[PDB]
Amino acid sequence: MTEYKLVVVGACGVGKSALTIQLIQNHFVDEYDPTIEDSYRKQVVIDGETSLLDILDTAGQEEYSAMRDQYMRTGEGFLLVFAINNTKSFEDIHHYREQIKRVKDSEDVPMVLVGNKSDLPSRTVDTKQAQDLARSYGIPFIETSAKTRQGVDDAFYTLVREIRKHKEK
Numbered sequence: 001m002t003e004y005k006l007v008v009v010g011a012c013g014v015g016k017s018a019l020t021i022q023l024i025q026n027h028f029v030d031e032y033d034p035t036i037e038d039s040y041r042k043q044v045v046i047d048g049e050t051s052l053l054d055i056l057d058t059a060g061q062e063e064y065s066a067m068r069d070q071y072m073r074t075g076e077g078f079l080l081v082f083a084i085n086n087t088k089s090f091e092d093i094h095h096y097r098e099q100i101k102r103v104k105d106s107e108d109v110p111m112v113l114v115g116n117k118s119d120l121p122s123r124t125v126d127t128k129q130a131q132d133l134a135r136s137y138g139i140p141f142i143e144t145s146a147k148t149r150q151g152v153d154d155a156f157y158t159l160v161r162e163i164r165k166h167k168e169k
């Protein structure tokens with residue numbers, strides 16, 4: 001069966017765990033321990049293809065090692081998550097993109113920029129700013145809400161379609 005190794009990255013509190021649980025369980029979590037990093041498998045049909053998604057929700061303390069780089073290198077596609085009400089989380093996207101570039105030795109890694117918490121009225125990051133960054137990286141931008149499920153399937157399925165496009169190259 002076709003397996004896709006997806007990794008959800010971004011700053012603390014942006015909704016990585018909530019997005020992962022909404023995708024896997026169809027449930028919104030108000031609290032998910034920030035020390036729990038784990039991977040979840042889900043079978044899905046995307047464009048007629050039965051796909052096994054293995055989703056790693058990154059967490060814990062910021063720490064680095066050769067072993068951690070070897071592990072992150074196995075990810076096939078990355079969701080770069082920020083929260084639309086947190087400018088710092090948007091500025092932090094650069095760090096996550098550079099760490100993926102560093103470990104993959106490539107400027108062509110499947111990724112999708114995700115602007116989460118789109119249900120909140122307290123926006124500080126304009127959609128145009130996020131589209132401009134995504135255009136600079138050459139990747140799609142998807143607005144999501146783990147709370148209402150807006151854009152969740154689209155964010156993960158678009159990443160899978162980007163991995164397929166990359167594998168065809």
Ligand SMILES: CCC(=O)N1CCN(c2ncnc3cc(-c4c(C)ccc5[nH]ncc45)c(Cl)cc23)CC1
Pocket residue numbers: 009010011012013016034035058059060061062063064065068069072095096099100103
């Ligand atoms: C609130 C707790 C929480 O959600 N955290 C989010 C993940 N954390 C990280 N913080 C800072 N930079 C990080 C950098 C990386 C990383 C990436 C994206 C790619 C290759 C890599 N090689 N080595 C590290 C690395 C990852 Cl996976 C996590 C980071 C802790 C806080």
Ligand SMILES: Nc1nc2c(ncn2[C@@H]2O[C@H](COP(=O)(O)OP(=O)(O)O)[C@@H](O)[C@H]2O)c(=O)[nH]1
Pocket residue numbers: 010011012013014015016017018019029030031032033034116117118119120144145146147148
């Ligand atoms: N309103 C709203 N809250 C969200 C959303 N996604 C996550 N949250 C909340 O934001 C907090 C941090 O979410 P979490 O998934 O733990 O973030 P993580 O540290 O990136 O894993 C939690 O209280 C979540 O319930 C969202 O789309 N909208």
Ligand SMILES: [Mg+2]
Pocket residue numbers: 016017018032033034036057058059
């Ligand atoms: Mg988390």
